[PDB]
């Protein structure tokens, strides 16, 4: 039956849309900003 149906993998499976791309980029930016804030807290001796 797989001869009739078919199965594959390609670029279109690994790609996503621009809304999801911008969401991912926003999450990465927020994470980097949080790490910068934690670094600032550590350097200012404000880390408990």
């Amino acid at each position: 039956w797989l001869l009739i149906e078919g199965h594959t993998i390609g670029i279109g499976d690994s790609i996503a849309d621009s809304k999801t791309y911008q969401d991912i980029q926003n999450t990465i930016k927020k994470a980097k900003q949080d790490v910068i804030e934690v670094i600032e807290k550590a350097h200012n001796n404000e880390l408990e």
Partner: protein
Amino acid sequence: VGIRFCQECNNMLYPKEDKENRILLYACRNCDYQQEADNSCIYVNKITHEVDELTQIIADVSQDPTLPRTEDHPCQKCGHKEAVFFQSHSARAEDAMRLYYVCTAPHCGHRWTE
């Protein structure tokens, strides 16, 4: 706490008892020289070994291209805006990520911590 040497053969002086005048003295083990002890303490160790690392920072590190430098913290003596910063930068330095600041100005080298 310090080590003082003999003035005759330049060997190490050792503390010893003066049993009649009841005073600590330093005497050489290789001759007969004796010297009165002013500090009146011999051995001391700090187990927690807290030391200011600002004394261990050479002022030459302002010429390092690899160290980061900031503009927000100015120097205290010359008021120079640019200054490099770095961490404790040593092993057995307990747990602290405290920054040490060195002014990167010519004929300067004031060191402060925040």
